[PDB]
Design an enzyme around this catalytic site. Structure first.
Site, PDB file in Angstrom:
ATOM      1  N   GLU A  24      33.153  41.975  44.876  1.00 31.64           N
ATOM      2  CA  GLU A  24      33.800  42.752  43.818  1.00 31.64           C
ATOM      3  C   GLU A  24      35.288  43.064  43.994  1.00 31.64           C
ATOM      4  OE1 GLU A  24      32.479  43.468  41.019  1.00 31.64           O
ATOM      5  OE2 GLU A  24      30.277  43.332  41.315  1.00 31.64           O
ATOM      6  N   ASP A  45      37.405  43.549  34.147  1.00 29.02           N
ATOM      7  CA  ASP A  45      36.498  42.719  34.923  1.00 29.02           C
ATOM      8  C   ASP A  45      36.441  41.297  34.291  1.00 29.02           C
ATOM      9  OD1 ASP A  45      34.790  43.052  32.831  1.00 29.02           O
ATOM     10  OD2 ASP A  45      33.056  43.793  33.973  1.00 29.02           O
TER      11      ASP A  45
END
Ligand SMILES: [Cl-]
Ligand SMILES: [Cl-]
Ligand SMILES: [Cl-]
EC number: 3.2.1.17
Length: 162
Positions: A11, A20
């Site tokens: 991540e 994202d």
């Protein structure tokens, strides 16, 4: 290697609001703020999550606290889920981490949707599970990450991350 270190690799860590892979506003170590297009809305969710006026930025410590909360929530979500729990219970420690990784990323419901893959994991047919997992939007959208998790499931080791 452990689940935290693993998700930290997949991540990353960002202290300021970002988009994202699907364009949603997130912050920290993959903490989704909102699906909404509004930066304001994002900023309001952040303030509410941290408990202060962040103005779109947080500290390291804050990022880590959210990460602890998210990981815990993912483990507990699995254990409460009728479809996931038995799988999780059937797996060895390395592979459990792979299952947690997917839940973190796509949520329980999403993961619970991989019916066939789940059934193969449970039966310990690793190569068949790997193939089933690969036939998905997930794999086509984030292939490198998908591959890393699928390999972990295939082999039961951390090679994909070392
Ligand atoms: Cl499936
Ligand atoms: Cl496909
Ligand atoms: Cl990727």
């Amino acid at each position: 290697m452990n689940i935290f270190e693993m998700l930290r690799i997949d991540e990353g860590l960002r202290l300021k609001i970002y988009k994202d892979t699907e364009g949603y506003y997130t912050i920290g170590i993959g903490h989704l703020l909102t699906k909404s297009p509004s930066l304001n809305a994002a900023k309001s969710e952040l303030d509410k999550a941290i408990g202060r006026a962040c103005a779109g930025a947080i500290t390291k410590d804050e990022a880590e606290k959210l990460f602890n909360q998210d990981v815990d929530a993912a483990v507990r979500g699995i254990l409460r889920n009728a479809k996931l729990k038995p799988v999780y219970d059937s797996l060895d420690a390395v592979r459990r981490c792979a299952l947690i990784n997917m839940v973190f990323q796509m949520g329980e419901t999403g993961v619970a949707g991989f019916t066939n893959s789940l059934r193969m994991l449970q039966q310990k047919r690793w190569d068949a599970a790997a193939a089933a997992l690969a036939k998905s939007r997930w794999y086509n959208q984030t292939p490198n990450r998908a591959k890393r998790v699928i390999t972990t499931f295939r082999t039961g080791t951390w090679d994909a991350y070392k």
